[PDB]
Amino acid sequence: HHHHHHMVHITLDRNTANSWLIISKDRRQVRMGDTHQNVSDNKERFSNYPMVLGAQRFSSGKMYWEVDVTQKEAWDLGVCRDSVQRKGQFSLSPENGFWTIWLWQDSYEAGTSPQTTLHIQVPPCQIGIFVDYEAGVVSFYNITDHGSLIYTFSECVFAGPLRPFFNVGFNYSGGNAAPLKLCPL
């Protein structure tokens, strides 16, 4: 791809984080803590899952950023509506305002309803995310494999401002403590 020139500097929004997340001082890294992180509750926080939003809101144009997923067993990445549900149980789907991919149990899947199997030959250590607001496109790229396409959501009905979306995943196994990191431009 040749999307790198629409690069945007994403930072994480502490106020949206599940209360067990630890966001770095530079707001570019997030990991699951081994307990509640001593913050007050608020209506923005994702309650049921280890999720957080980027601070930036996008309502036009082309945007591109990259995320490091090295040595994680589970995660979700993409974009979502600013108005997505925060509390209780929900599925990641375009109907619920999410355009995402994930790793779970040694398989990669796109967050369609029902979910779509991804075909990845080279497990990615860094993921590129491209949004074209006007075109209604969200695309994912394998930076480890020379930028190869992972998945394109097209005919997207955003229906609102978009925010970068992250899930560090559960760490029941003890093998998923590693952070998500926003990679430099």
Ligand X SMILES: Cc1c(Cl)cccc1NC(=O)[C@@H]1CCCO1
Interaction between residue 104 and ligand X (CB under 6 A): no
Tell me the CA distances in angstroms from 52 to 76, 79, 82, 151, 163, one per residue in order: 11, 11, 12, 22, 10
Q: How far is the CB of 175 from ligand X (least distance, A)?
A: 11
Interaction between residue 20 and ligand X (CB under 6 A): yes
Distance, CA of 81 to CA of 95 (rounded, Å) = 11
Interaction between residue 100 and ligand X (CB under 6 A): no
Name which position in 42, 170, 175, 185 contacts ligand X (CB under 6 A): 170
Q: How far is the CB of 179 from ligand X (least distance, A)?
A: 14
Name which position in 10, 12, 16, 18 contacts ligand X (CB under 6 A): 18
Interaction between residue 16 and ligand X (CB under 6 A): no
- Looking at residue 160, the DSSP 8-state letter turns out to be S
What is the size of the binding site for ligand X (CB under 6 A)?
8
Under DSSP, is residue 127 helix (H, G, I), strand (E, B) or coil? strand
Q: How far is the CB of 95 from ligand X (least distance, A)?
A: 22
Which residues does the chain break after (C to N > 2.5 Å)?
A: none
Interaction between residue 50 and ligand X (CB under 6 A): yes
Residue 50 phi/psi, 5° resolution? -85, 60
> Residues 118, 151: contact at Cβ < 8 Å?
yes
Residues that bind ligand X (CB under 6 A): 18, 20, 32, 49-50, 170-172
